[PDB]
Amino acid sequence: EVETFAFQAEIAQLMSLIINTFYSNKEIFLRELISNSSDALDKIRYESLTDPSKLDSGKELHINLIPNKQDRTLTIVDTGIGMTKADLINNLGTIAKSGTKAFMEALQAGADISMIGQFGVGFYSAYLVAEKVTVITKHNDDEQYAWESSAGGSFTVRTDTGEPMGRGTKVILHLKEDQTEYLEERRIKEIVKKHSQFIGYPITLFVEK
Ligand SMILES: Fc1ccc(-c2cn[nH]c2)cc1
Secondary structure (H helix, E strand, O other): OEEEEEOOHHHHHHHHHHHHOOOOOOOHHHHHHHHHHHHHHHHHHHHHHHOHHHHOOOOOOOEEEEEEOOOOEEEEEEOOOOOOHHHHHOOOOOOHHHHHHHHHHHHHOOOOHHHHHHHOOHHHHHHHOEEEEEEEEEOOOOOOEEEEEOOOOEEEEEEOOOOOOOOEEEEEEEEOHHHHHHHOHHHHHHHHHHHOOOOOOOEEEOOOO
16 A cells, blocks of 8 residues: 655755765765665664663674665665654654755855755755665664655655564665776775764665675
8 A cells, every 4th residue: 555745846846956966976876875864873872871771672783785786776774763654754864854945045055065964954865876666664662664756746655564673674775787896895995985974873784786
């Protein structure tokens, strides 16, 4: 049972700016998604400081990068706090309407797309490299859901019947055909060392074959 939703106008315009602008420094998407994961991991560690049973759904706090060349996908898994259904619908837990207002003022006043993370909407930089993004998520207080969008002004949300997650968020990037470099081992390593050396959680890059 799939529900289809319209993006708010300001979000749809942010995603088409990201899809259509000529901007070569596309590798920042990964920095942005890892930093979102690290923020959700901070949130569940804070909650467990007073209630330890909030880690009954998994005590390990980590980030995994899983390239898959046959599927042409890059997946970013974290065991962070996760999103409820209401977070998913509400622009994936962000204040995206006002953050796009600020961001897209800054672009006309000096800034460039690489500062998108300073406005709370870094998730959407995923569309620099992906034609389609799927977010599987499980929050302790809700069921597991799948959010899905190929841009074009709409997204879908459904109950995910697949592999139980325990707790966390899985961002699946279905990459554009000319962005396959972000599936190679040495290119991902180079981006993680460049932009994410101080993330306070173990980032494991899986290998293939
Ligand atoms: F409210 C939220 C909770 C978790 C996340 C997230 C983003 N990447 N991984 C997890 C985003 C919003």
